[PDB]
């Protein structure tokens, strides 16, 4: 009855004085907007239907038109920013928040979904959803003794919507809204559904993507052990956000970085730094770089966990972007490490793969590598082993490459190049 209607027909039904006719047309609209090939969102908007759909959200007496309108508006709100704006401009936000209390679960869920699309547009709509008071009713839907009694699809939708309220920067979500949400997020991070876990980790990754104070809010809730556990999961959709969150945390203070180390994170990096997904390797190497930028005792834990050989590994062979992250990890290690730690790094074979990367067509990695050489030489100066290092560099083809670089466009390159040749060679 309600399949493949024209917009013209939907409009005629919706403008009828007949609630049942309006219901059939709203369902027809929903089915249009639910089609996979190019749903006519803009024709629906141009027909002036959004205000009608929004008014139908408020018809408590007619639950089916509430649902059909909810779903229609959800699909419009899933499109461009402009499409989402049209839904918001129609007054949908408060009307969807009212529907969170619906006795009908399918309607409540639709309202959750719609608010998730609205908040996911960006900071401004996210913050407007929050101002209209969405968070209390959302969290009330998860206030049960055991999350396992909720329907799977419902809990997944709620988690996804909450993650969108945690998302975006410039600005980041209000501190009080983050404090309000975090306890429910901690609970979802212990739920056993892979999709709930993935979206919970994504939420934590967003909340840790910022200054130390934002990181502290999360770290203080004691989630880092659970994040490290999830970092060891089989499901890539869990590992990806868990590793991003862990990586975000170690961009903070040395004491925040230590909580990740204390939680056992470094024991997973052998796998992460050899992971077949390029992105996991990249992000794991980035994470390592901000751990090697830490304290000497923190560098020592990297050493004890057997991870220097894995950094030599990624430097020797990886996607280029991973190799650049590894070069950073080495410069940081050499910058902050004791002489013994820097010696160990050479003993593990760092020199040849570093020198092979000086052939790269990237100015930044060259500068990074040259800084690392300088730091290593400085440790050799303190041991009076500058010559053995010079010979090592020379034997693997390094001296050739550094010489060339004395004649490179970038100034800091040729400078650092020249200094090395003239001081050690």
């Amino acid at each position: 009855g309600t399949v493949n209607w024209s917009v013209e027909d939907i409009v005629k039904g919706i403008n009828s004085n007949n609630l049942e006719s309006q219901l059939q047309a709203t369902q027809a609209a929903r089915k249009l907007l639910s089609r996979e090939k190019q749903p006519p969102i803009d024709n629906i908007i141009r027909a002036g239907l959004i205000p009608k759909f929004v008014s139908f959200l408020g018809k408590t007496d007619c639950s089916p038109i509430q649902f059909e309108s909810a779903w229609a508006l959800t699909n419009i709100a899933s499109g461009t920013s402009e499409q989402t704006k049209a839904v918001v401009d129609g007054g949908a936000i408060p009307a969807f928040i009212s529907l969170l209390a619906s006795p009908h679960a399918h309607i409540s869920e639709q309202a959750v979904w719609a608010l998730g699309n609205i908040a996911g547009d960006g900071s401004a709509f996210r913050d407007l959803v929050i101002k209209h008071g969405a968070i209390d009713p959302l969290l009330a839907l998860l206030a049960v003794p055991d999350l396992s009694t909720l329907a799977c699809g419902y809990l997944r939708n709620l988690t996804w919507t909450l993650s969108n309220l945690c998302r975006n920067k410039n600005p980041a979500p209000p501190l009080d809204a983050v404090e309000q949400i975090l306890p429910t997020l901690v609970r979802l991070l212990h739920h056993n559904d892979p999709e709930v876990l993935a979206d919970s980790c994504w939420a934590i990754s967003y909340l840790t993507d910022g200054p130390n104070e934002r990181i502290e809010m999360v770290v203080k809730k004691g989630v880092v052990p659970q994040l490290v556990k999830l970092l060891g999961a089989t499901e890539l959709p869990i590992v990806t956000p868990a590793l991003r969150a862990i990586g975000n945390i170690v961009t903070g203070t040395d004491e925040q970085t230590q909580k990740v180390i204390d939680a056992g994170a470094l024991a997973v990096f052998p796998s992460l730094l050899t992971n077949p997904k390029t992105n996991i390797q990249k992000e794991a190497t980035w994470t390592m770089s901000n751990i090697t930028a830490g304290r000497q005792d923190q560098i020592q834990q990297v050493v004890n966990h057997g991870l220097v050989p894995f950094l030599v590994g990624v430097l020797s062979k990886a996607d280029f972007k991973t190799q650049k992250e590894a070069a950073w990890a080495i410069t940081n290690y050499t910058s902050g490490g004791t002489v013994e730690q820097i010696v160990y790094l050479v003993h593990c074979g760092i020199i040849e793969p570093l020198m092979n990367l000086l052939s790269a067509k990237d100015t930044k990695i060259i500068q990074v590598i040259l800084d690392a050489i300088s730091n290593i030489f400085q440790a050799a100066e303190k041991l009076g082993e500058t010559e053995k290092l010079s010979i090592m560099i020379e034997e693997c083809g390094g001296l050739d490459k550094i010489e060339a670089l004395q004649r490179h466009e970038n100034e800091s390159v040729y400078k650092a190049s020249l200094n090395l040749i003239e001081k050690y060679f």
């Binding site: 907007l33 639910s34 996979e36 749903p39 779903w71 959800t74 699909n75 709100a77 899933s78 499109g79 989402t84 399918h106 639709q110 979904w113 998730g116 699309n117 996911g120 547009d121 996804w160 969108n164 998302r167």
Partner: peptide
């Protein structure tokens, strides 16, 4: 990623 259309029930 940020938005999701509902395709059916």
């Amino acid at each position: 990623p940020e938005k999701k259309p509902k395709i059916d029930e």
